[PDB]
């Protein structure tokens, strides 16, 4: 059960868009995160 606290929404009302940008830190490990300017993937060098 890793999907309960995932079905979310921004509970604020003074918020801009967020976009499900897949992030990798260094390990080829993708996580869906919401960030400004709809990126599709990330890597921290």
């Amino acid at each position: 059960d890793s999907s309960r606290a995932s079905l979310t929404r921004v509970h604020r009302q003074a918020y801009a868009r967020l976009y499900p940008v897949l992030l990798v830190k260094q390990d080829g490990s993708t996580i869906h995160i919401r960030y400004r300017e709809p990126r599709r993937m990330l890597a921290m060098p």
Binding site: S2, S3, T8, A14, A16, R17, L18, E37, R40, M41
Partner: protein
């Protein structure tokens, strides 16, 4: 009464990969993204997309597409590590990567004389030994590896006592932090099981009732 003093352990693998979603959770997630968009408040990404092409229409009447295209192709560059090393193997029961989204439980054959039983891994304890220390000794004994597990407490989880000389069987619950599980093709018969094969591999009442303290999720 001479008690055959038996300790044991029930080993857990925490899933590194998340579970897939319900289709109802799919429709609800899509709905939350729609209604989440509906109440947002002027993201600068669209301010650098919507009004900019309006101003370019004003300049032509008298780049966001490149950013999206680069993000799309760079999305096409890095392939995803596949969440399924599960159906291709299909018989690597000894391997730690048999499943990724569920819990995995250690489970070892034991050959006795009066019995011959496929058992959740045990040990034999001494009154001097701590029960937690019995399970700590149980960790790096039977597998013959360099794992790194983790317990929680000296509280047990599931007790089953069978006789034929008195006896008792105590079931703890550990949790694998990491594993330097050297030479996974052992001579031992450790098998990692999700939940369903525990009702397959383990028939009797002292073993068909382990799943009521296995974290089923």
């Amino acid at each position: 009464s001479p008690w055959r003093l038996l300790g044991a352990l029930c080993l857990q693998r925490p899933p590194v990969v998340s579970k897939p979603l319900t289709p109802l959770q799919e429709e609800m997630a899509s709905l939350l993204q729609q209604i989440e968009i509906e109440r947002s408040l002027y993201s600068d990404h669209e301010l650098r997309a919507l009004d900019e092409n309006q101003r370019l229409a004003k300049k032509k009447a008298d780049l966001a597409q490149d950013l999206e295209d680069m993000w799309e192709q760079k999305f096409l560059q890095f392939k995803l590590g596949a969440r399924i090393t599960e159906a291709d193997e299909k018989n690597d029961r000894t391997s730690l990567n048999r499943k990724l989204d569920r819990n995995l439980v250690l489970l070892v054959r034991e050959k006795f004389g009066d019995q011959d039983v496929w058992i959740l891994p045990q040990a034999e304890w001494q009154p001097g030994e701590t029960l937690r220390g019995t399970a700590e000794r149980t960790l790096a004994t039977l597998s013959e590896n360099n794992m790194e597990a983790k317990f929680l407490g000296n509280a047990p989880c599931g007790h089953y006592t069978f006789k034929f000389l008195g006896a008792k069987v105590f079931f703890f619950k550990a949790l694998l932090l990491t594993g330097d599980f050297s030479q996974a093709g052992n001579k031992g018969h450790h098998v990692w099981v999700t939940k369903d094969e525990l009702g397959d591999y383990l028939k009797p009442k002292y073993l068909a009732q382990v799943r009521r303290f296995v974290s089923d999720l």
